[PDB]
């Protein structure tokens, strides 16, 4: 947005503020939800897609709540800012302190005896740099149960990661390891559980950088081995060393990409990898969502003639309609 | 492993046996079996454990399913018939002497019968290992389990795995060694999720955790080694077996035993654990695990003591003396394991 934001005004904005209200029925933009084994690196994926650091990382299982994720477009005031549903008149301009806000709110509601829950919390983040829309970070799915969880952790997670990704308006984001074989993945399982066509998932390769010496993602990535609808993506986000030594997102950036380059036997690759790559790639497919959507430039044309002598008239009418036309034709390949 | 189950096993027979022919008893066997098995999740490194503890290599390993059917290894104890040979039961009157071979041998019979490269199948490959250095053990090596299927393979292949697994472990005479990757988070483990349901107290459970050498920097296995993170009936034991470069140069077994003990002692958070890690220590903790089972028959030292002062009590009649010098000299062997484990 980038790309997405350009075509948004293109009508929601400015030229579909053409005359509306007459039982036009009915922008809805897709959720975009994370999926994968406990510690796959579903919250470092996502960040990486939203651009900041403000989602607890690490251990260990850290992300014990769903976090419903809404960003918003803001009238281009450079006053970008975040807020939650449970501290309503509080605004934060860091993103660490939503950082530090999310996990004091999940400790609240659990205890580091290491209980998930299933009720979200809610979160927007204002932006003229966004288009609307919602996010999703869920609890990664696990086999055992222990600490002192309850008995019936394991199908709870299996059924709240459920509850979201159900719903046919969601694109799944389902991140896989590359340090375990893709046989074992529990993202794969999931997304084919609910998805099974495979239509709305696109598949993500984390912790690139931690294979075993002998071992390569290139089959997987080049489509090879276990094929998508969609290619796979491959991502390296940051170490728990590099969490430790509280690493910033930009450095990661860099690294990610020292590593895509800088690697041989990914090198021909890297020009297609990369949370950077992956984001356009999410970019373009939601580009396509409204696009389809334009096939009502025959609502443009509905009016125009069947106004030209309906009493003059309104030249004027049919200027916005000029101007409409103008817009939501002035947007011809962005995908 | 075998040497002091071996210099105990053999301290006995030649006492129950070659004595206590109080005839009329019961009956030796059952726990002179336990099997063992590993199990775990696709590519954990059930494998290269099993060998190690073996101590010969002669299963395939890889990267992608390679371990596709049961392959079920009764081990034997020559006459000290000093001759390492092994044989196939479905290809009998065949002995092999090269290993290397043998491997080869597991899966050529694998891929045969699978079909596709990537088919598994629930009929075990019978081999046995003769060699008069490691005593009478049944060994259980196993596909590991997965989660979805991936390429060539059919689709209830997940439940087919588990229900091939699950076979072989539901049964109490049975080792589980629960192995788990440490560079996964162990609440996503394959193993001890099912060793914990066939096995719920944990009794017949080992839990091995393979790969240290793998995690991601900023983490290490300290906590579920000291026994804090995931308690189990027995302390954790951890490995590093060989990569999968290891395996593509060929590093063998010297080297590789040689590689883990450098592993351990040498970097700093094991340091203090090292000697309670790798895979020798993990057989010398099975076989104590096995000598205690034995050493829990000799409360058998009582269906002798009855021959005694049931017969010191007691034209040819006093002949006697030697039934005694022989229910003595048993006491010669089971008085002489009293201290063992
Ligand atoms: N080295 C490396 N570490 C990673 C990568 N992705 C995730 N991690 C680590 O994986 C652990 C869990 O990451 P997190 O984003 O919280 O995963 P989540 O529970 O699925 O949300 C942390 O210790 C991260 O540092 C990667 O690509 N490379
Ligand atoms: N670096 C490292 N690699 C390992 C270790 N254990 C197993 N591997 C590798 O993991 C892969 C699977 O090993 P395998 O013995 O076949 O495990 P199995 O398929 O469960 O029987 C091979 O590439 C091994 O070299 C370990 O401790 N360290
Ligand atoms: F272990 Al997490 F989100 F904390 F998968
Ligand atoms: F991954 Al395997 F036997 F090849 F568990
Ligand atoms: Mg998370
Ligand atoms: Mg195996
Ligand atoms: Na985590
Ligand atoms: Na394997």
Redesign the pocket.
């Given at each position: 947005e980038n790309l997405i934001s350009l075509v948004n005004k293109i009508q929601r904005a400015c030229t579909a503020l053409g005359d509306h209200g007459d039982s036009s029925a009915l922008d809805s933009l897709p959720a975009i939800a994370?999926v994968?084994?406990?510690?796959?690196?579903?919250?470092?994926?996502?960040?990486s897609i939203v651009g900041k650091d403000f989602?607890?990382?690490?251990?260990?299982?850290?992300?014990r709540r769903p976090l419903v994720l809404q960003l918003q477009k803001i009238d281009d005031g450079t006053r970008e800012y975040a807020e939650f549903l449970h501290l309503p008149r509080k605004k934060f301009t860091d993103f660490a302190a939503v950082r530090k806000e999310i996990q004091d709110e999940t400790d609240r509601e659990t205890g580091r005896s290491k209980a998930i829950s299933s009720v979200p919390i809610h979160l927007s983040i204002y932006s003229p740099n966004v288009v609307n829309l919602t996010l999703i970070?869920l609890?990664?799915l696990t086999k055992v149960a222990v600490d002192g969880q309850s008995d019936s952790i394991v199908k709870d997670i299996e059924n709240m990661v459920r509850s979201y990704i159900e719903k046919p308006n969601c694109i799944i984001l389902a991140?896989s390891?590359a340090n375990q074989d893709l046989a074992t993945s529990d993202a794969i399982k999931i997304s084919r559980e609910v998805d099974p066509s495979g239509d709305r998932t696109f598949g993500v390769l984390?912790?690139?950088?931690?294979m075993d010496k002998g071992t390569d993602a290139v089959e997987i990535l080049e489509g090879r081995s276990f094929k998508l609808k969609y290619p796979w993506v491959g991502?390296?986000?940051?170490?728990?060393?590099?969490?430790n030594k509280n690493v910033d997102m930009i450095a990661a950036r860099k690294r990610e990409r020292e590593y895509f380059s800088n690697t041989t036997e990914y090198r021909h690759l890297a020009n297609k990898m990369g949370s950077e790559h992956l984001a356009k790639m999410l970019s373009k497919h939601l580009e396509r969502v409204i696009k389809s959507r334009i096939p009502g430039i025959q609502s443009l044309i509905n009016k125009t003639v069947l106004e030209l002598e309906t009493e003059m008239e309104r030249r004027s009418a049919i200027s916005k309609r000029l101007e409409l036309y103008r817009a939501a034709q002035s947007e011809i390949d962005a995908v």
């Open positions: 994370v994968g084994g406990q510690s796959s690196g579903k919250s470092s994926v996502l960040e989602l607890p990382r690490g251990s260990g299982i850290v992300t970070d609890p990664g991140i390891p984390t912790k690139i950088d931690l991502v390296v986000n940051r170490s728990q060393a590099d969490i």
